[PDB]
Amino acid sequence: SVSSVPTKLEVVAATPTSLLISWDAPAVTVVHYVITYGETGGNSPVQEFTVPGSKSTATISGLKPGVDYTITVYTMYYSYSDLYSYSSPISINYRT
Amino acid sequence: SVSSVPTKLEVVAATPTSLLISWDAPAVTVVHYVITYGETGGNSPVQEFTVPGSKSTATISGLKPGVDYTITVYTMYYSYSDLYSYSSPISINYRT
Amino acid sequence: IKSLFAVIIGGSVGCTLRWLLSTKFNSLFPNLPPGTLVVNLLAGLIIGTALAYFLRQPHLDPFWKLMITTGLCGGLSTFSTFSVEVFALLQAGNYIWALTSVLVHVIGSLIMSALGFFIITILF
Amino acid sequence: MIKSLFAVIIGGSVGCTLRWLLSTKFNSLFPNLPPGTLVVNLLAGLIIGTALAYFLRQPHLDPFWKLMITTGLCGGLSTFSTFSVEVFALLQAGNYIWALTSVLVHVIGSLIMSALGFFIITILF
Ligand SMILES: CCCCCCCCCCO[C@@H]1O[C@H](CO)[C@@H](O[C@H]2O[C@H](CO)[C@@H](O)[C@H](O)[C@H]2O)[C@H](O)[C@H]1O
Ligand SMILES: CCCCCCCCCCO[C@@H]1O[C@H](CO)[C@@H](O[C@H]2O[C@H](CO)[C@@H](O)[C@H](O)[C@H]2O)[C@H](O)[C@H]1O
Ligand SMILES: [F-]
Ligand SMILES: [F-]
Ligand SMILES: [F-]
Ligand code: NA
């Protein structure tokens, strides 16, 4: 039972309206990572996009300045037992 | 159950001390054919040699003139059931 | 033990289908035995659709998932029969069909997995 | 053919169960070229290679025991479908180098083990 969840999720670079995030890949065949993000306060709608499994970085654009954003990343990965399945997420908070 | 034994075994050409034999191949994956030959009057040692499965002809040299020779050909062939196995022979007689 | 029965019930169905298909058809075209090809192409098609389907239905029982993939597709497909067929052709000096067998089995099985995956993906 | 059916099922169940244990234990250790799925194919190649040489020299064995080893055990133990999805998954992951390597190592390796099986039993004779 190897962990399919990424580790070391962090913001490497940031402008007022964008974040560059990177993560350590899990020791499994990741087909794609799903990056989700939304305003930590309340119930502004959370958006998601995918990046290919080869990539271990992503740019989140069009954010609001000075706003607390919750950012999660989870994988869609091949394993012998489960075939394609979705991992649990790793999550961080970051104020622009 | 396809026949792995060759057909149409015959002498195409002949000198006093050699025969050229040809055969129609069986409808199976032949790895090699084994050609055996000896003097029909049953008191002289039978010799055998192989030819690759791609070949459907063989030359038998060093025979005695005016002597009845028995000539057999059988295959060593792949089949799903038996794996590698030896087919029954097809046999002919020929006087030099 | 429940997992063990999924593998055996699925595997027995797969192995039995392979056994009937191979003994019936393989002899028809011995350069590229069609029974052994069909079972690999069919297993690729089944596991391709299984790939796309189990993604969209993540809370199915591991029993039913294990019965299709490790059981049926595992039992139905074969690499050992594929090898001896090629090996036999290699010893027979039949390189062109030995190569063709390797390409048709490998390239074909991925195409059937793609067709399985992309049909179920395209169908909502 | 009911006796033949039991050879396929008894052999196949042993093969599928060995594959299931080996794959679930080891595949995760090196996901670029899952070793459990490789080992079962290389082992099945080795078994059927020795079977190739052995059944030739012993032509009067029961078709039951022959069918139990080849169609049963080696058939159940080896796998092409698991080999395909592993490659397919790598292809969708953009991991072409290991997708190619997997195809070569499985194919080239399985023939080498069949040759080793065949030529060991041939030489020991
Ligand atoms: C024998 C061949 C059969 C041919 C059948 C026709 C197939 C044509 C290509 C389908 O188009 C692809 O569909 C994917 C969706 O299935 C998209 O992936 C998207 O979605 C994936 C997850 O579903 C992510 O992994 C990708 O990163 C993301 O680009 C991908 O962009 C798009 O090009
Ligand atoms: C040779 C014989 C075999 C023939 C049949 C094989 C069929 C294999 C299916 C490939 O699937 C595609 O693979 C792409 C990667 O290879 C993915 O691209 C994804 O990843 C790329 C980067 O790796 C990005 O550029 C794309 O936008 C993104 O959709 C894409 O989603 C996925 O559907
Ligand atoms: F194999
Ligand atoms: F397959
Ligand atoms: F693989
Ligand atoms: Na199998």
Residue numbers in the entry:
A (entry chain C), B (entry chain D): 1 to 96
C (entry chain A): 2 to 125
D (entry chain B): 1 to 125
From the paper:
The moderately conserved Thr114 lies at one end of the polar track, distant from bound F- ions, and its substitution by Ala abolishes channel activity, as if its hydroxyl group is necessary for ushering the anion into the narrow pore from the aqueous vestibule. However, a stark refutation of this idea emerges from the complete inactivity of T114S, despite a T114S crystal structure showing the Ser hydroxyl exactly overlaying its WT counterpart and no significant structural changes elsewhere (Cα rmsd ~0.2 Å, Figure 4—figure supplements 1 and 2). In the WT structure, this contacts the Gly49 Cα, V85 Cα, and F88 side chain, all from the partner subunit. Thus, it is possible that the T114 methyl participates in a nonpolar interaction critical for stabilizing the conducting structure of WT (a structure that nevertheless is still observed in T114S crystals). We therefore conjecture, without compelling evidence beyond the crystal structure itself, that Thr114 contributes to the pore’s structural integrity but does not coordinate F- during its transit.
